Amino acid sequence: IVEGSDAEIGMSPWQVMLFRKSPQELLCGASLISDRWVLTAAHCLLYPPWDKNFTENDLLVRIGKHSRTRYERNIEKISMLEKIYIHPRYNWRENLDRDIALMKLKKPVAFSDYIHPVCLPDRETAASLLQAGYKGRVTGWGNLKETGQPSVLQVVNLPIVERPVCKDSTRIRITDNMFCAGYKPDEGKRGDACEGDSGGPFVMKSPFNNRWYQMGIVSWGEGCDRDGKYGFYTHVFRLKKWIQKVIDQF
């Protein structure tokens, strides 16, 4: 996260770290959606242009964390993966359309002050809150600038951007399964996700029921925090029928 701040303890209790077993390293962010299910970006698990195609046994998830690098004894919980599910129409070839994946844990994780699931949006909350200018919140342990790494989880609040502005910022083909967020060059404030934040959540706090909803997944950007560029996020509500189908079946 570029131009963010340190998270408060328990601020993002749904945040998950995707962790490579060997070598031991941060791969991506992720989020806890129930005691057995974790949501992330498909490209965190499958990206053939970079020879990336992880299997369940390659990975762990670390839940309840605050520190990036330290083993948070008696606080974090480390879970093995039973199964990965990638959206069947995830487009790794072109533009990361439908950049979403689910991971089922081998055993349920115990909730605590530090570990608690986020809500997935219903149609009405999504329609009400996914509006240009409305801000969400992005969290992660990724790099602090494009060109270094944080001691603890970082947080930044960023406004959703009008779709024509998103499209006009890039040569990449933008789809209805994406939205973009960030400040404009003339807005003064700044901030973005960066490398290592992918897969983590873009959340909004509903003013109707005071619950946090995950509206987006950190998906892609051209650099980090560049003027005139924006971060692109997977539109979770648009893909929720797939999420529900996977959870219902498996």
């Binding site: 701040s5 408060e8 303890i9 328990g10 601020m11 209790p13 959606i33 129930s34 005691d35 605590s112 002050d113 530090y114 608690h116 699931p117 986020v118 809500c119 997935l120 809150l129 200018g133 409305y134 801000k135 969400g136 919140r137 947080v155 609040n157 406004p159 909004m204 706090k205 509903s206 003013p207 005071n210 619950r211 946090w212 909803y213």
Partner: peptide
Amino acid sequence: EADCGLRPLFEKKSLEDKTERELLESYI
């Protein structure tokens, strides 16, 4: 889940985090 999106150290205790008000103020 039924209890989703309510943080033990914040909403469950009626404590606000340092920047959630910035989000609320944008929901105009």
